[PDB]
Every structure is written in structure tokens, then in C-alpha cells.
Amino acid sequence: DNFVMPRQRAVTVERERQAGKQRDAYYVTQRVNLQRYFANGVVSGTYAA
Amino acid sequence: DNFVMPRQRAVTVERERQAGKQRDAYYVTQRVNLQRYFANGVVSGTYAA
């Protein structure tokens, strides 16, 4: 419950014909981060040094 | 009366969505000069040196 994925855009595929290279260029962008509402909330385990 | 602004194009705006870079570019271009029909006609006053 402490973690939220702040969004803002979702996978946007944008294709631009880039003639002159006779190519079609597809670009996909997304802006997402994991965040945590409050500092606490995860414990990780580690193999021992 | 001696000066005319020779035109040829006036301020126009062209938006060119450039996907693949995800920008939208506004290129505004214009073409004009200030020219005098005959050389006479301007006196400028100058601060002294």
C-alpha cells in the first residue's frame, strides 16, 4: 500500500516517417516511477558478505 | 515617402509535429526589408565624440 506508480503518460508509440532515410521510425515513450508514500515499508534480504 | 518596406511573405506560423522527438515545432517565418526609393531622406543626430 505504500507504493504508488506516479504516471503522467502511458506507452505512447509515435511513428514518424523519416523519409530521406526511407525509414519509418517508431518511438515509444512512457513516464513512470515507483515512489513510496512514506519512507518505511520494504525489507530486503541479502546473502551474507 | 521615400521609404517602402518591400514585402514578399508575411508572418505565418507552421507547426510541425515532430514525432520521434515528441516535440511540436512552431516555425514562424517572414521576409521584408526597408528600402528607400532614392538615397535622400534621413538625417541622424549624434551625441558627440
Short mmCIF file of N, CA and C in Angstrom, two decimals:
data_model
loop_
_atom_site.label_atom_id
_atom_site.label_comp_id
_atom_site.label_asym_id
_atom_site.label_seq_id
_atom_site.Cartn_x
_atom_site.Cartn_y
_atom_site.Cartn_z
N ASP A 1 0.75 -1.24 0.00
CA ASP A 1 0.00 0.00 0.00
C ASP A 1 0.77 1.27 0.00
N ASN A 2 2.03 1.24 0.35
CA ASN A 2 2.83 2.41 0.45
C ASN A 2 3.29 2.86 -0.88
N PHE A 3 3.29 2.02 -1.91
CA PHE A 3 3.89 2.39 -3.16
C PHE A 3 2.92 2.65 -4.22
N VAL A 4 3.12 3.72 -4.94
CA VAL A 4 2.24 4.09 -5.99
C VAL A 4 3.10 4.30 -7.17
N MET A 5 2.62 4.07 -8.38
CA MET A 5 3.36 4.41 -9.57
C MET A 5 2.92 5.74 -10.14
N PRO A 6 3.58 6.85 -9.77
CA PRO A 6 3.09 8.06 -10.36
C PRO A 6 3.17 8.06 -11.88
N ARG A 7 2.07 8.09 -12.63
CA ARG A 7 2.10 8.17 -14.10
C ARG A 7 2.21 9.55 -14.64
N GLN A 8 1.60 9.89 -15.77
CA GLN A 8 1.69 11.18 -16.47
C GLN A 8 1.55 10.92 -17.97
N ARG A 9 2.07 9.83 -18.50
CA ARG A 9 1.83 9.45 -19.89
C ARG A 9 1.91 7.97 -19.93
N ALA A 10 1.17 7.30 -20.79
CA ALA A 10 1.31 5.89 -20.90
C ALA A 10 1.80 5.47 -22.26
N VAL A 11 2.57 4.38 -22.28
CA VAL A 11 3.24 3.98 -23.50
C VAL A 11 2.72 4.56 -24.77
N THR A 12 3.37 5.59 -25.25
CA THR A 12 2.90 6.20 -26.45
C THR A 12 3.80 5.80 -27.58
N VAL A 13 3.28 5.15 -28.59
CA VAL A 13 4.07 4.79 -29.72
C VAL A 13 3.83 5.85 -30.72
N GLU A 14 4.88 6.52 -31.17
CA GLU A 14 4.74 7.53 -32.19
C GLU A 14 5.61 7.21 -33.36
N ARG A 15 5.05 7.22 -34.55
CA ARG A 15 5.79 6.85 -35.71
C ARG A 15 6.00 8.05 -36.53
N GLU A 16 7.22 8.30 -36.94
CA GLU A 16 7.46 9.41 -37.82
C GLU A 16 8.08 8.84 -39.01
N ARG A 17 7.56 9.17 -40.17
CA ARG A 17 8.18 8.72 -41.37
C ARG A 17 9.37 9.59 -41.45
N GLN A 18 10.51 9.04 -41.78
CA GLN A 18 11.69 9.82 -41.78
C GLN A 18 12.15 9.55 -43.13
N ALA A 19 11.50 10.16 -44.10
CA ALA A 19 11.93 9.99 -45.45
C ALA A 19 13.22 10.66 -45.58
N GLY A 20 13.96 10.26 -46.57
CA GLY A 20 15.30 10.79 -46.73
C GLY A 20 16.18 9.74 -46.18
N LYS A 21 15.63 8.85 -45.39
CA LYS A 21 16.38 7.75 -44.89
C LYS A 21 15.47 6.64 -45.32
N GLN A 22 14.32 6.97 -45.90
CA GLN A 22 13.33 6.00 -46.39
C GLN A 22 13.00 5.07 -45.31
N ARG A 23 12.88 5.58 -44.11
CA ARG A 23 12.68 4.72 -42.98
C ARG A 23 11.46 5.15 -42.28
N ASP A 24 10.89 4.29 -41.48
CA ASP A 24 9.76 4.65 -40.69
C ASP A 24 10.33 4.53 -39.35
N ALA A 25 10.14 5.49 -38.49
CA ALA A 25 10.78 5.48 -37.20
C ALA A 25 9.74 5.39 -36.16
N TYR A 26 9.83 4.45 -35.26
CA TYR A 26 8.80 4.29 -34.29
C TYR A 26 9.43 4.59 -32.97
N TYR A 27 8.81 5.44 -32.18
CA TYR A 27 9.37 5.82 -30.90
C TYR A 27 8.38 5.64 -29.82
N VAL A 28 8.72 4.94 -28.76
CA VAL A 28 7.78 4.67 -27.70
C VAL A 28 8.31 5.28 -26.44
N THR A 29 7.50 6.03 -25.70
CA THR A 29 7.94 6.70 -24.51
C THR A 29 6.92 6.55 -23.41
N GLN A 30 7.34 6.54 -22.16
CA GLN A 30 6.46 6.34 -21.03
C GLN A 30 7.06 7.09 -19.90
N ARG A 31 6.32 7.64 -18.96
CA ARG A 31 6.99 8.28 -17.83
C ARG A 31 6.50 7.80 -16.50
N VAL A 32 7.14 6.82 -15.90
CA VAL A 32 6.62 6.24 -14.71
C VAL A 32 7.67 6.03 -13.68
N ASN A 33 7.36 6.13 -12.39
CA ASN A 33 8.33 5.97 -11.32
C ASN A 33 7.68 5.24 -10.18
N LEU A 34 8.40 4.57 -9.29
CA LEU A 34 7.80 3.73 -8.26
C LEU A 34 7.40 4.36 -7.00
N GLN A 35 8.15 5.33 -6.53
CA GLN A 35 7.81 6.07 -5.34
C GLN A 35 7.35 5.35 -4.08
N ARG A 36 7.17 6.06 -2.99
CA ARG A 36 6.69 5.40 -1.82
C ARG A 36 6.08 6.51 -1.06
N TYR A 37 4.94 6.30 -0.45
CA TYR A 37 4.29 7.40 0.18
C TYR A 37 5.14 7.77 1.36
N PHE A 38 5.60 6.83 2.16
CA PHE A 38 6.33 7.15 3.36
C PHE A 38 7.57 6.37 3.30
N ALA A 39 8.56 6.72 4.08
CA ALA A 39 9.85 6.08 4.00
C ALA A 39 9.89 4.61 4.26
N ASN A 40 9.12 4.13 5.20
CA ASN A 40 9.14 2.74 5.56
C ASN A 40 8.41 1.86 4.66
N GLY A 41 8.64 0.57 4.78
CA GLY A 41 7.88 -0.37 4.01
C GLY A 41 8.50 -1.48 3.24
N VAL A 42 9.82 -1.55 3.12
CA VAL A 42 10.45 -2.66 2.45
C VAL A 42 11.54 -3.23 3.26
N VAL A 43 11.75 -4.53 3.23
CA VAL A 43 12.89 -5.11 3.87
C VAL A 43 13.45 -5.96 2.78
N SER A 44 14.75 -6.03 2.59
CA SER A 44 15.29 -6.89 1.60
C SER A 44 16.20 -7.78 2.30
N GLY A 45 16.50 -8.93 1.74
CA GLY A 45 17.32 -9.88 2.44
C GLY A 45 18.57 -9.89 1.63
N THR A 46 19.68 -10.20 2.22
CA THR A 46 20.88 -10.31 1.46
C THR A 46 21.67 -11.53 1.77
N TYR A 47 22.39 -12.03 0.80
CA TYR A 47 23.22 -13.16 1.02
C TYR A 47 24.30 -12.57 1.88
N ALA A 48 25.04 -13.34 2.64
CA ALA A 48 25.97 -12.74 3.56
C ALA A 48 27.27 -12.44 2.98
N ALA A 49 27.80 -11.26 3.28
CA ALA A 49 29.07 -10.83 2.75
C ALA A 49 30.13 -11.89 2.70
N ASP B 1 8.01 59.47 -47.22
CA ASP B 1 7.62 58.96 -48.52
C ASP B 1 8.64 58.22 -49.30
N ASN B 2 9.90 58.37 -48.97
CA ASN B 2 10.96 57.76 -49.71
C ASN B 2 11.11 56.33 -49.35
N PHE B 3 10.60 55.87 -48.21
CA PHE B 3 10.89 54.52 -47.78
C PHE B 3 9.74 53.62 -47.89
N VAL B 4 9.98 52.45 -48.40
CA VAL B 4 8.95 51.48 -48.57
C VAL B 4 9.45 50.25 -47.94
N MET B 5 8.59 49.40 -47.41
CA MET B 5 9.01 48.11 -46.92
C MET B 5 8.77 47.01 -47.94
N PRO B 6 9.76 46.69 -48.79
CA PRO B 6 9.44 45.65 -49.72
C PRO B 6 9.07 44.34 -49.05
N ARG B 7 7.83 43.83 -49.15
CA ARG B 7 7.45 42.53 -48.58
C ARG B 7 7.73 41.37 -49.46
N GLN B 8 6.93 40.32 -49.48
CA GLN B 8 7.13 39.06 -50.22
C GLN B 8 6.49 37.93 -49.42
N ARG B 9 6.55 37.94 -48.10
CA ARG B 9 5.82 36.97 -47.28
C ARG B 9 5.52 37.66 -46.00
N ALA B 10 4.42 37.36 -45.35
CA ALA B 10 4.17 37.95 -44.07
C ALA B 10 4.11 36.92 -42.97
N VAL B 11 4.29 37.32 -41.72
CA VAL B 11 4.35 36.37 -40.63
C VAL B 11 3.33 35.23 -40.67
N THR B 12 3.77 33.98 -40.75
CA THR B 12 2.94 32.80 -40.88
C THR B 12 3.46 31.82 -39.88
N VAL B 13 2.64 30.89 -39.45
CA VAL B 13 3.10 30.02 -38.43
C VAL B 13 2.92 28.65 -38.95
N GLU B 14 3.90 27.79 -38.80
CA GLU B 14 3.74 26.46 -39.23
C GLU B 14 4.15 25.54 -38.16
N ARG B 15 3.25 24.69 -37.70
CA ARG B 15 3.53 23.76 -36.63
C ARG B 15 3.84 22.48 -37.28
N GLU B 16 4.88 21.81 -36.85
CA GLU B 16 5.27 20.59 -37.50
C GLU B 16 5.47 19.56 -36.46
N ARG B 17 4.47 18.77 -36.14
CA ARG B 17 4.68 17.84 -35.09
C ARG B 17 5.76 16.95 -35.52
N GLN B 18 6.80 16.90 -34.71
CA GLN B 18 7.93 16.08 -34.99
C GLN B 18 7.89 14.95 -34.05
N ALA B 19 7.08 13.97 -34.34
CA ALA B 19 7.05 12.79 -33.51
C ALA B 19 8.35 12.10 -33.72
N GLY B 20 8.76 11.33 -32.76
CA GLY B 20 10.00 10.63 -32.86
C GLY B 20 10.92 11.46 -32.07
N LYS B 21 10.54 12.69 -31.81
CA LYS B 21 11.32 13.51 -30.94
C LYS B 21 10.31 14.03 -29.96
N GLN B 22 9.05 13.76 -30.22
CA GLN B 22 7.99 14.24 -29.35
C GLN B 22 7.97 15.73 -29.08
N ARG B 23 8.15 16.55 -30.10
CA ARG B 23 8.13 17.98 -29.96
C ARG B 23 7.18 18.42 -30.96
N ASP B 24 6.73 19.64 -30.88
CA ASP B 24 5.87 20.18 -31.88
C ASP B 24 6.58 21.45 -32.09
N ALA B 25 6.99 21.73 -33.31
CA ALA B 25 7.80 22.86 -33.57
C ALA B 25 7.01 23.89 -34.24
N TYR B 26 7.09 25.13 -33.79
CA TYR B 26 6.42 26.18 -34.48
C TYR B 26 7.49 26.96 -35.14
N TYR B 27 7.44 27.03 -36.46
CA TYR B 27 8.46 27.70 -37.19
C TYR B 27 7.71 28.83 -37.73
N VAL B 28 8.00 30.02 -37.29
CA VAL B 28 7.39 31.20 -37.87
C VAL B 28 8.37 31.96 -38.66
N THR B 29 8.11 32.08 -39.94
CA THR B 29 8.99 32.84 -40.84
C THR B 29 8.42 34.07 -41.54
N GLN B 30 9.26 35.03 -41.92
CA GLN B 30 8.79 36.28 -42.52
C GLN B 30 9.89 36.91 -43.37
N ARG B 31 9.55 37.56 -44.50
CA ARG B 31 10.54 38.19 -45.39
C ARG B 31 10.35 39.68 -45.79
N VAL B 32 11.11 40.62 -45.23
CA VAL B 32 10.93 42.05 -45.51
C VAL B 32 12.12 42.95 -45.35
N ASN B 33 12.19 44.08 -46.04
CA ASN B 33 13.36 44.96 -45.99
C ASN B 33 12.87 46.37 -45.87
N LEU B 34 13.72 47.35 -45.60
CA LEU B 34 13.31 48.75 -45.59
C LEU B 34 14.19 49.38 -46.61
N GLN B 35 13.63 49.91 -47.66
CA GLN B 35 14.48 50.46 -48.66
C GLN B 35 13.92 51.77 -49.08
N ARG B 36 14.77 52.66 -49.54
CA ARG B 36 14.34 53.97 -49.91
C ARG B 36 14.27 54.03 -51.41
N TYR B 37 13.30 54.74 -51.96
CA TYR B 37 13.26 54.88 -53.38
C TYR B 37 14.51 55.61 -53.85
N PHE B 38 14.88 56.70 -53.19
CA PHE B 38 16.03 57.49 -53.63
C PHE B 38 16.90 57.68 -52.42
N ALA B 39 18.18 57.91 -52.58
CA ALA B 39 19.07 57.97 -51.42
C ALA B 39 18.77 59.02 -50.37
N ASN B 40 18.22 60.14 -50.74
CA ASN B 40 17.99 61.18 -49.78
C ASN B 40 16.92 60.88 -48.81
N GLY B 41 16.92 61.53 -47.67
CA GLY B 41 15.82 61.36 -46.76
C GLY B 41 16.03 61.06 -45.31
N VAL B 42 17.23 60.75 -44.87
CA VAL B 42 17.41 60.55 -43.46
C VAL B 42 18.47 61.43 -42.91
N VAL B 43 18.25 62.05 -41.76
CA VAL B 43 19.29 62.79 -41.10
C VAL B 43 19.35 62.16 -39.77
N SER B 44 20.51 61.81 -39.27
CA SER B 44 20.57 61.30 -37.94
C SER B 44 21.34 62.25 -37.07
N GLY B 45 21.02 62.32 -35.79
CA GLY B 45 21.66 63.28 -34.93
C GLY B 45 22.48 62.47 -33.99
N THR B 46 23.69 62.89 -33.69
CA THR B 46 24.56 62.06 -32.90
C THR B 46 25.11 62.72 -31.69
N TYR B 47 25.29 61.96 -30.64
CA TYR B 47 25.93 62.51 -29.48
C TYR B 47 27.37 62.71 -29.91
N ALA B 48 28.05 63.71 -29.40
CA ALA B 48 29.40 64.00 -29.85
C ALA B 48 30.44 63.10 -29.29
N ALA B 49 31.55 62.96 -30.02
CA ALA B 49 32.64 62.14 -29.54
C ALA B 49 33.71 63.02 -28.92
#
